[PDB]
Amino acid sequence: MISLIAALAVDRVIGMENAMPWNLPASLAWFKRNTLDKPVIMGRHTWESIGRPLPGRKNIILSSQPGTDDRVTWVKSVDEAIAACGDVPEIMVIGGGRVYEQFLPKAQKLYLTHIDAEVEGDTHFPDYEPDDWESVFSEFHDADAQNSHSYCFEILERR
Amino acid sequence: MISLIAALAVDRVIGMENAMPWNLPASLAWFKRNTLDKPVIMGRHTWESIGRPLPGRKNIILSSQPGTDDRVTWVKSVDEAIAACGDVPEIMVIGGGRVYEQFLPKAQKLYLTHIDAEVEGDTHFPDYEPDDWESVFSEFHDADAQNSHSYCFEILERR
Lengths: 159, 159
Ligand SMILES: CN(Cc1cnc2nc(N)nc(N)c2n1)c1ccc(C(=O)N[C@@H](CCC(=O)O)C(=O)O)cc1
Ligand SMILES: CN(Cc1cnc2nc(N)nc(N)c2n1)c1ccc(C(=O)N[C@@H](CCC(=O)O)C(=O)O)cc1
Ligand SMILES: [Ca+2]
Ligand SMILES: [Cl-]
Ligand SMILES: [Cl-]
Description:
The PDB classes it as oxidoreductase. The entry lists the keywords oxidoreductase. It forms a dimeric assembly. 2 copies of one chain form a homodimer. In chain A, 20% of the residues lie in helices and 31% in strands. Chain A is of the alpha/beta class. Chain A has one domain (1-159): Dihydrofolate Reductase, subunit A (3-Layer(aba) Sandwich). An 8-stranded mixed β-sheet of chain A has the order 4-3-2-5-1-6-8-7, with helices on both faces. The A-B interface holds A 17-23, 45, 48-49, 51, 117, 143-149 and B 17-23, 48-49, 51, 117, 143-149. The site of one chloride ion has 7 residues of chain A, from α2.
């Protein structure tokens, strides 16, 4: 089963290249809890923003360009990315935009962090008609001394 | 001598009700570099925001209220704060607003990170007179894959 995990600002704006203007360690903990011990597929820009292999996960980079680093798996197509995962219960696709667009059709679950931040951006998370998806869990949190903005975790299942 | 080290958004904003809406590991690395192996003096709110004692530094908390952690030194006056420092070449004051206000008058140097972020602030860095300070180092950087906003590091020495 393929799942997409994303952090979205108002209007579904997502990061493109530069780091997003927010500080949400609680959201990063949610991210870690949901991807640990699973294969993660990301595009090149996401890899650069991360800056190192995520520990405890099989890191797969989908890109047309060459594999800089030997610590991760470089793939050139969706098929190859899938194959590289082997046979596991759940594959996590962590972005960016183009990567999400390529896997959404095959996706069965969405883990989303909705953040109350108005960011100007070009890229948006693909349009999902939540009537093709059942929202199964939603939990809101206010901003605090450690988290810059209000955020809401949501899990949606493909119906 | 005493030095103040701070991260200022536009209009000299240093703090908000919640965590600052930025992600700047480069600025945190500059903060680490310049405070390592030195005593650091902070107010209670800054302490609570950090969450733990800063490694490799002597952590001194200036507050009217009682000590909640055995890992740090709790002081009740600027005078006591200074004394707790011992015989060191440089004492770093890391905030917040009220602490900076109390130490500015005794400071000989400022290490500033100016960040291009427009935010409604709660607390601001005390107004400094540009005629009283000399900039001896400046370095600009744009936002990138890991840093959400452009910033510039500056070190000023009292004329
Ligand atoms: C830029 N980036 C991509 C990123 C960030 N937040 C997301 N958040 C959500 N919800 N979804 C994503 N796909 C997502 N992707 C990053 C950057 C750093 C780490 C990271 O350091 N993660 C550590 C946890 C934090 C830490 O140890 O500092 C981990 O083990 O996952 C993760 C993703
Ligand atoms: C909230 N806060 C106060 C803070 C933040 N940035 C600043 N930046 C500058 N330039 N000046 C300050 N006084 C300053 N103070 C913090 C929070 C965390 C860490 C921190 O984790 N510092 C690690 C470095 C970062 C890391 O390991 O992620 C250190 O060793 O100094 C420091 C200050
Ligand atoms: Ca100069
Ligand atoms: Cl990407
Ligand atoms: Cl404080």
